[PDB]
Amino acid sequence: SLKIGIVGFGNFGQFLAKTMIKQGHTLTATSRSDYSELCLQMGIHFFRDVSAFLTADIDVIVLCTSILSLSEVVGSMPLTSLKRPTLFVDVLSVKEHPRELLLRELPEDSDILCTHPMFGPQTAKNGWTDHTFMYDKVRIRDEVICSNFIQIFATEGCKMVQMSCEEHDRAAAKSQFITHTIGRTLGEMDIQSTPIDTKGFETLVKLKETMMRDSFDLYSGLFVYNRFARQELENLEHALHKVKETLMI
Amino acid sequence: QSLKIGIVGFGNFGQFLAKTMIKQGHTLTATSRSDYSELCLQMGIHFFRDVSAFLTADIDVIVLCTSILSLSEVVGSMPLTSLKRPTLFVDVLSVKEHPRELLLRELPEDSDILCTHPMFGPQTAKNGWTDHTFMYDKVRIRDEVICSNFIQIFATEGCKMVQMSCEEHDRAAAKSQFITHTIGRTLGEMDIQSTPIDTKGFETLVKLKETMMRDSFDLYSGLFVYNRFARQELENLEHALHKVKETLMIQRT
Ligand SMILES: NC(=O)c1ccc[n+]([C@@H]2O[C@H](COP(=O)([O-])OP(=O)(O)OC[C@H]3O[C@@H](n4cnc5c(N)ncnc54)[C@H](OP(=O)(O)O)[C@@H]3O)[C@@H](O)[C@H]2O)c1
Ligand SMILES: NC(=O)c1ccc[n+]([C@@H]2O[C@H](COP(=O)([O-])OP(=O)(O)OC[C@H]3O[C@@H](n4cnc5c(N)ncnc54)[C@H](OP(=O)(O)O)[C@@H]3O)[C@@H](O)[C@H]2O)c1
Ligand SMILES: N[C@@H](Cc1ccc(O)cc1)C(=O)O
Ligand SMILES: N[C@@H](Cc1ccc(O)cc1)C(=O)O
Numbered sequence: 001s002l003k004i005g006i007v008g009f010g011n012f013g014q015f016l017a018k019t020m021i022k023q024g025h026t027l028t029a030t031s032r033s034d035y036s037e038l039c040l041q042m043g044i045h046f047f048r049d050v051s052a053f054l055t056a057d058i059d060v061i062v063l064c065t066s067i068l069s070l071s072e073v074v075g076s077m078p079l080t081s082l083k084r085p086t087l088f089v090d091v092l093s094v095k096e097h098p099r100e101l102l103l104r105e106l107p108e109d110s111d112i113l114c115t116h117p118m119f120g121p122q123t124a125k126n127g128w129t130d131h132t133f134m135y136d137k138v139r140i141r142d143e144v145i146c147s148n149f150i151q152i153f154a155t156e157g158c159k160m161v162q163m164s165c166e167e168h169d170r171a172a173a174k175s176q177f178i179t180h181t182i183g184r185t186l187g188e189m190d191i192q193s194t195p196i197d198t199k200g201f202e203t204l205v206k207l208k209e210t211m212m213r214d215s216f217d218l219y220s221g222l223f224v225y226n227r228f229a230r231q232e233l234e235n236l237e238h239a240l241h242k243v244k245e246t247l248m249i
Numbered sequence: 250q251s252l253k254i255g256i257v258g259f260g261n262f263g264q265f266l267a268k269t270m271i272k273q274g275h276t277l278t279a280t281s282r283s284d285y286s287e288l289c290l291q292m293g294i295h296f297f298r299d300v301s302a303f304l305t306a307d308i309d310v311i312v313l314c315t316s317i318l319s320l321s322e323v324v325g326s327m328p329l330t331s332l333k334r335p336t337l338f339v340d341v342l343s344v345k346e347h348p349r350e351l352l353l354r355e356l357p358e359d360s361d362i363l364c365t366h367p368m369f370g371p372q373t374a375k376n377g378w379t380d381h382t383f384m385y386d387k388v389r390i391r392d393e394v395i396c397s398n399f400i401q402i403f404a405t406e407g408c409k410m411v412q413m414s415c416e417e418h419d420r421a422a423a424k425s426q427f428i429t430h431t432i433g434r435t436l437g438e439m440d441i442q443s444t445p446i447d448t449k450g451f452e453t454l455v456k457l458k459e460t461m462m463r464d465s466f467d468l469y470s471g472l473f474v475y476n477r478f479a480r481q482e483l484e485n486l487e488h489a490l491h492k493v494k495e496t497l498m499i500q501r502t
Contacts, residue, residue, distance in 0.1 A: 014287055033283075037264050041291035 001025055002148055005058045007073065008065030009035045009046070011215075012091065015121050016064065017042065019128065020152060028056060032065075032073075054081050060149055063090040063098070067221025070098055074105050085109040087145050091117055093218060094172065095165030097225040099138050112138040113146055114165055116172070117153065122210045129157030136165050173228035178236055180219050183211025250398050251275055255308040257300070257323065258315030259285045261465070262341065265371050266314065267294060269378065269406060278306050282315075282323075304331040310399050312339045313348065317471025320348055324355050335359040337395050341367060343468060344422065345415035347475040349388050362388040363396055364415050367403065368426070372460040379407030386415050423478035428486060430469050433461025 002025045006013045009031040017027050027044045029035060030053035039046035047053035054077065065073045070092060088110055090098040095114050102112050119131035133153040140146045154160055186208035193205055211219075223229045252275050256263045259281040267277055277294040279285060280303035289296035297303040304327065315323045320342060338360055340348040349364045356362065369381035383403040390396045404410055413421075436458035443455055461469075473479045 011284075034261070038288045038291065041288060 002145070002152075003028075003057055003059045004149075005029065005053060005056065005061050007031070007050075007053075007061060007063050007077075008069075009033075009039070010064065010066075012120055013062075013064035014038070014042075016062065016091070016117075017044065019156060023152060023155070025152070028053065028058070050076065051078055051081060054078060055083060057083070058086060059145055060087045060089055063088065063092070066215070066217045067092050067094055067097065067225050068217050071101055074101065079105075079107055079110075082107065082110070085111070085142070087111040087113060087140075087142065087149065089113045089115060089149060091115055093176065093222055094226045095134075095136065095168040096227065099136065099165040103139065111140050111142055111146065113140065113149065114138050116168060117158070118176075122213050127156065128153065131158055132161055133158040134161045134163060134168055136163065136168070138165070169226045170228050172222070173226050173232045177222045177226065177229045178232055179207070180211050180214070180222060181233065181236060183208050184219060187212045250401060252395070252398055252402075253278070253307055253309040254399075255279065255303060255306060255311045256294075257281070257303070257311060257313050258319075259283075259289070259294075259296070260314070260316075262370055263312075263314035264288070266312065266341070266367075267292065270402065273402060273405065275402075278303065278308060300326065301328050301331055304328065305333055307333075308336060309395055310337045310339055312341060314341055316465070316467045317342050317344055317347065317475050318467050321351060324351060329355070329357055329360075332357065332360065335361070335392075337361040337363060337390075337392065337399065339363045339365055339399060341365050343426070343472055344476045345384075345386065345418040346477065349386065349415040353388065361390050361392060361396065363390065363399065364388050366418060366422075367408070370464075372463050377406070378403065381408055382411055383408040384411045384413055384418055386413060386418070388415070419476045420478050422472070423476050423482045427472045427476065427479045427482055429457070430461050430464070430472060431483065431486060433457050434469060437462045 004020055004025050004027050006017055006027065006029040009017070009029040013029065013031070017029065021027050021042065021044065028047060029039055029044060030047040030050050034048060036046050036048070047056070063070065063073070070090070088102060088106055090102065092098045093116060095116060099112070099114050102114075106112065113135060115133065115135040117131070117133050119128065124131050135150060137146065150160070186204060191205055191208055193202070197205070223233070251273075254270055254275050255278040256267060257280055259267070259279040260283075263279070263281070267279070270277055271292060271294075277292075278297065279289055279294050280297045280300050284298060286296050286298070295306065297306065313320065313323070320340075335357070338352055338356055340352065340363070342348045343366055345364050345366060349362070352362050352364075363385060365383065365385040367381070367383050369378065374381050385400060387396065400410070436454060441455055441458060444451075447455075473483070
């Protein structure tokens with residue numbers, strides 16, 4: 001049982017909180033917007049003031065804010081007020097950025113665990129089993145607390161993948177970022193089902209619908225803060241152009 | 250007497266009203282600028298992200314719970330021709346001449362208008378609404394049954410029921426609640442602290458400060474910008490403080 005504080009209690013913060021509560025951990029939260037009533041509903045304590053959140057009795061701080069805002073959020077936190085050395089976990093969709101920034105900004109005696117649960121409310125509605133949880137033990141000295149946190153995902157059946165933040169971003173730029181870009185592009189075309197949909201087109205409509213559920217902040221953070229994304233955007237754009245020219249001749 | 254109620258603006262006060270409406274057995278729908286999907290799931294409310302879908306739902310009464318400052322933009326963005334049926338619009342803004350004038354100008358003629366201000370909220374009616382004041386003005390009512398069923402929501406909670414014009418409301422609110430918030434905001438800027446030797450009077454001021462600082466600055470701003478009688482009351486406050494101050498100087502001398 002862990003005392004887990006969520007920083008950024010939005011869509012994915014709430015998603016993680018439901019399962020950690022179910023396992024019996026003690027959850028608290030803080031966020032830019034006021035989630036007092038939703039935390040009341042869920043049965044957890046919300047701290048309108050980040051300073052009171054950080055002086056509380058807390059084993060793990062999970063950074064669930066948007067990629068775009070992480071630097072501002074960490075910058076606004078009075079981290080010297082931490083009672084104890086504390087494990088910091090990030091769940092951002094890109095990994096080199098939070099690794100670099102937490103190593104730079106956190107107090108040195110705070111541990112760092114960089115993760116990406118490769119799933120969320122769209123793909124893992126009825127549980128985490130067989131979805132991938134990527135993690136990088138960036139700066140761990142309390143292996144007990146870190147293992148307790150990682151076990152949250154192991155006991156839910158996740159496929160557990162240790163890899164560096166760099167290898168994550170290289171792979172994510174080719175897969176997740178391309179998938180979102182295609183979903184977003186179909187969203188601007190506003191593709192719609194017809195009476196003669198093929199199965200392939202049905203999957204694309206569904207892919208469009210699920211990708212459009214993520215914020216534009218999230219999508220844009222995949223591009224801005226993954227140094228490998230720009231070339232994958234080029235690869236996609238160049239390939240489409242080459243396909244077009246085989247048709248145009 | 251159980252209603253299909255849609256709430257526009259599911260923020261701090263919209264949620265406050267919904268809690269008691271759910272307790273009474275009403276069926277609630279909500280829409281808002283921000284996404285309250287999860288919280289509405291918890292409370293059993295049907296949440297529409299898009300106001301156009303909101304307006305085609307099965308709604309008896311639409312309750313406008315957006316900030317004073319945003320009412321004009323929110324109503325303006327509503328495709329009001331999407332309305333399935335003539336519908337009662339209720340306003341719960343803390344000032345009243347403004348929504349009354351705007352809804353009479355903007356709403357479809359066939360839609361009824363009840364202009365209200367519950368003189369209480371999360372800070373003062375935390376443990377129930379009993380013997381708090383609920384003000385209302387029947388601006389344009391033709392279906393008396395639905396209007397009466399809505400007003401019943403507050404009467405059954407033990408509210409003090411005050412029928413009064415929107416003008417008379419703003420006249421009284423400029424002299425009272427605006428002054429109260431101004432004093433609380435002034436004490437908040439002074440950041441007054443408790444002391445070894447607090448008197449009871451000072452204790453109530455500290456408490457008043459804390460309660461007044463819990464409302465949004467948008468709200469406090471709306472009390473002044475959209476009440477044509479607030480400006481004179483802010484002058485009367487400064488004028489009174491300076492009158493007291495000068496008598497101290499004369500007493501000093
Ligand atoms: N399935 C998923 O959605 C998923 C999966 C894996 C990882 N992630 C990652 O989890 C994190 C949150 O994802 P999300 O889906 O909830 O959507 P998101 O739009 O990326 O992030 C929303 C959260 O970021 C906060 N936020 C945004 N801008 C802020 C700013 N200037 N200042 C302070 N706080 C700000 C928001 O606070 P408020 O809510 O209080 O306004 C909210 O809590 C992201 O880093 C995402 O990359 C998401
Ligand atoms: N005790 C009270 O607080 C109390 C008592 C009586 C009457 N009232 C009145 O009830 C109404 C709500 O008050 P409140 O306490 O909840 O705080 P408020 O700050 O006055 O209003 C908050 C609501 O206004 C919405 N909003 C603000 N700016 C907006 C904009 N440009 N566009 C669209 N929506 C906007 C917000 O939408 P989102 O939440 O989706 O962001 C939120 O729902 C006010 O008119 C107030 O005068 C309040
Ligand atoms: N939100 C998607 C997955 C996802 C996870 C993280 C991301 O960064 C992006 C997408 C889902 O429900 O599975
Ligand atoms: N929000 C405070 C004060 C307040 C009352 C009425 C209002 O219209 C606005 C603010 C309360 O709980 O009472």
